[PDB]
Amino acid sequence: LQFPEASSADVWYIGKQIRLNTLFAKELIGKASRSLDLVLSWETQNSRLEEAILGGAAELIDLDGANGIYFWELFFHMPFMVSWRFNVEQRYEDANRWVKYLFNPFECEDEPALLLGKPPYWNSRPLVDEPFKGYSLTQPSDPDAIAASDPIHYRKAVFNFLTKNIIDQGDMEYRKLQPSARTLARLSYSTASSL
Amino acid sequence: LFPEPWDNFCRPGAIEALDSPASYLLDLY
């Protein structure tokens, strides 16, 4: 779809294309079915593969727009509660790994670097969202969901939380009676010191 | 150095305080 680009009066839009059909979904029929093999048969490299659609990118639109902006959240979503509940338990660890899909929070792969992508789609620490990136600022209109949705790295607060949850979990198991009463709390150390 | 050196880049917002509108809620004006 296209705006009237020859328009006389000045508008916030000057000219705007739409990729209406959002047929990127068809490539996703393919690759998503391929990932049906397994998780991690899902990849940020598939995220990178947005180039292989129309020679383009994955600034998604329509419900796929939503799924895209939700994309990491989609995956993270129960990890969120794997924290809420299961950081009191264990697979918080896995949730960490899943954040590590979204990002590299962990203390690792300094040398591997472009191992995780010769194109620097990722960054040493992918501080923005793996699909996403920073943008021009804007003037406010702001029901809370707007914030909950805002196109900004603030979301890293998540990682911060996750991390504190990790150490907090460790702290509680150390709240358990155990003569090795400092010991593995060293990880509480490592964590805290990571900030 | 140490392998995979730690780097919590607290990216520089140069964090500075922000006004509550509840204080001076009259801004509702």
UniProtKB/Swiss-Prot annotation, chain A:
Effect of loss of the gene: Cells with a disrupted yenA1-yenA2-chi2-yenB-yenC1-yenC2 locus are no longer pathogenic in C.zealandica larvae.
Compartments it resides in: Secreted
Disulfide bonds: none
PTM field: The isolated toxin complex includes 3 peptides starting between residues 768 and 778 of this protein, which might be physiologically relevant.
Subunit record text: Semipurified toxin complex consists of at least YenA1-YenA2-YenB-YenC1-YenC2-Chi1-Chi2. The Yen-TC:K9 subcomplex is about 26 nm tall and 22 nm in diameter with 5-fold symmetry and 5 copies of YenA1, YenA2, Chi1 and Chi2; the chitinase subunits may be solvent accessible on the exterior the complex. The Yen-TC:K9 subcomplex has no insecticidal activity. The native complex with additional YenB, YenC1 and YenC2 subunits is 16 nm taller and is insecticidal; the toxicity-conferring subunits are present at about 1 copy each.
Function recorded in the entry: Part of an orally active toxin complex (TC) with strong insecticidal effects on larvae of the Coleoptera Costelytra zealandica, Acrossidius tasmania and Adoryphorus couloni and some Lepidoptera larvae. The TC has an endochitinase activity.
Name of the featured protein: Toxin subunit YenA2
Top-level taxonomy: Bacteria, Pseudomonadati, Pseudomonadota, Gammaproteobacteria, Enterobacterales
Full protein stretch here: 537 to 731 of 1364
From Swiss-Prot, chain B:
Gene ablation phenotype (knockout): Cells with a disrupted yenA1-yenA2-chi2-yenB-yenC1-yenC2 locus are no longer pathogenic in C.zealandica larvae.
Cellular compartment(s): Secreted
UniProt superkingdom: Bacteria
Bilayer-crossing regions: none
Function noted in UniProt: Part of an orally active toxin complex (TC) with strong insecticidal effects on larvae of the Coleoptera Costelytra zealandica, Acrossidius tasmania and Adoryphorus couloni and some Lepidoptera larvae. The TC has an endochitinase activity.
Assembly behavior: Semipurified toxin complex consists of at least YenA1, YenA2, YenB, YenC1, YenC2, Chi1 and Chi2. The Yen-TC:K9 subcomplex is about 26 nm tall and 22 nm in diameter with 5-fold symmetry and 5 copies of YenA1, YenA2, Chi1 and Chi2; the chitinase subunits may be solvent accessible on the exterior the complex. The Yen-TC:K9 subcomplex has no insecticidal activity. The native complex with additional YenB, YenC1 and YenC2 subunits is 16 nm taller and is insecticidal; the toxicity-conferring subunits are present at about 1 copy each.
Official protein name in the record: Toxin subunit YenA1
Gene responsible for this protein: yenA1
Covered range of the whole protein: 139 to 167 of 1164
